[PDB]
Amino acid sequence: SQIVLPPHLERIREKLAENIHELWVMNKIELGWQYGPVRDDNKRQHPCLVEFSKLPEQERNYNLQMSLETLKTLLALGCHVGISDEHAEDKVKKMKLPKNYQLTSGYKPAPMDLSFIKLTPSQEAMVDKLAENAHNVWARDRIRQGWTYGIQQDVKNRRNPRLVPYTLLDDRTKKSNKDSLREAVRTLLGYGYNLEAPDQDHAARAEVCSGTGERFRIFRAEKTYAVKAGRWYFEFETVTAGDMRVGWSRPGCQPDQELGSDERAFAFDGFKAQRWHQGNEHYGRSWQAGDVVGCMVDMNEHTMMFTLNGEILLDDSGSELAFKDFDVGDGFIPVCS
Ligand SMILES: Nc1ncnc2c1ncn2[C@@H]1O[C@H](COP(=O)(O)OP(=O)(O)OP(=O)(O)O)[C@@H](O)[C@H]1O
Ligand SMILES: COc1ccc2c(c1)CN(Cc1ccc(C(=O)O)cc1)CCS2
């Protein structure tokens, strides 16, 4: 609402509103909609097919407001607009149209066909965002009405399966709104009022949202199974490919601290290809979904090694040892974050 409309948009939006009005009535007659005295969509009768003057002024004004919200929404998207020229707006060609596609009046509303104009990926993205905003303004109205979501539409209980996020919306209506949006944006472009998209903003949430406030969960064997000597091996399977750590931990490990940040644990972060013990150093490569990581420790020469799907993971050098030397201490147990 805080947005103020430029005069060139003001002298463009009345012509926009009319043009899309006839766009709407041509879409209606192409799909096979007929004129009728009564307000019955199932019986295929509606006085809406006549010109906007004979059309109910409520709908005609609603169309103008509908377009006004659309203009204010292009402006609020951060999509700045430029004026290409004036003569292409003064002179707009008209396709020849078939009689069956024509209504009772001989006037052909379909203006210079938008097929010449091509939709860039950014122009499609803003079409998606306009569709999202229209759906959201559609649902704010329904919620104000008190209509709530329901798996099956209820006329009396005011339940519409339609009140869902646009991503979850049914493909039929989503496409129908999308087409009118797409044709609306193309009509805006064909008015010579070329729109330049805001720069692509990259936003990564890094999965801050989590159960309560826990960032990670640590799974380990019981402290009584600590190994002090010998050769030991266990395997860790990665169903997903995200922030994981696997390795050997001392019985003094804190469940709230990250693996390898302190001296109590030795871990391998394949997500960043990092080996973790009081710091991170580059080691090995990254895993994908389904990769199996093997962990081997030999407390005789105090070495630690790792395998990704069988092959030995190396550090920056040619050495196969993730942690060359450590102390036996109290022992080690398998651990995973
Ligand atoms: N001239 C017009 N300008 C703008 N929008 C219009 C116009 N005529 C009809 N509409 C649209 O028609 C729709 C009316 O049906 P709607 O999709 O809201 O059904 P609904 O969700 O079942 O509604 P309700 O919950 O009120 O029963 C609205 O989204 C409204 O924006
Ligand atoms: C979405 O902005 C507009 C702007 C202009 C016009 C329409 C829609 C189309 N309408 C017909 C209509 C009425 C109700 C429904 C419905 O029940 O959803 C669907 C179509 C009015 C004539 S021009």
Measured by CA distance, the residue closest to atom 24 of ligand 1 is 142
Tokens 């799909």 -> residue: 31
Q: Ligand 1 centre and the CA of 115: distance in Å?
A: 29
Classify each residue of 229-260 as buried b or exposed e, where b means 16 or more C-beta atoms within 10 Å of its C-beta: eeeeeeebebeeeeebbbbbbbbebeeeebbb
Classify each residue of 144-158 as buried b or exposed e, where b means 16 or more C-beta atoms within 10 Å of its C-beta: eeebeeeeeeeeeee
Q: Are 177 and 162 in contact (CB under 8 A)?
A: no
Q: Ligand 2 centre and the CA of 163: distance in Å?
A: 18
Q: Give the residue, out of 59, 137, 174, with the most ligand 1 atoms within 8 A of its beta carbon, to mutate for a pocket test.
A: 59
**Experimental method used, please?**
cryo-EM
Q: Ligand 1 centre and the CA of 35: distance in Å?
A: 20
Task: Report the pocket of ligand 2 as residue ranges, CB < 6 Å.
Answer: 21, 24, 48, 59, 63, 66
Between the CA of residue 77 and those of 8, 69, 120, 179, 187, what are the distances in Å?
A: 18, 12, 16, 19, 18
Q: Is the dihedral of CA 20, 21, 22, 27 positive or negative?
A: positive
Between the CA of residue 254 and those of 212, 215, 248, 280, 310, what are the distances in Å?
A: 19, 14, 13, 18, 30
Task: Report the distance separating Cα 190 and Cα 58, nearest Å.
Answer: 28
Which tokens is 270 given? 């394949």
Which tokens is 27 given? 């879409």
Measured by CA distance, the residue closest to atom 20 of ligand 2 is 24
The ligand 1 atom nearest the CA atom of 153: 22
Tell me the sheet residues that pair with 247: 267, 335
Of 184, 23, 42, 195, nearest to 108 (Cα)? 23
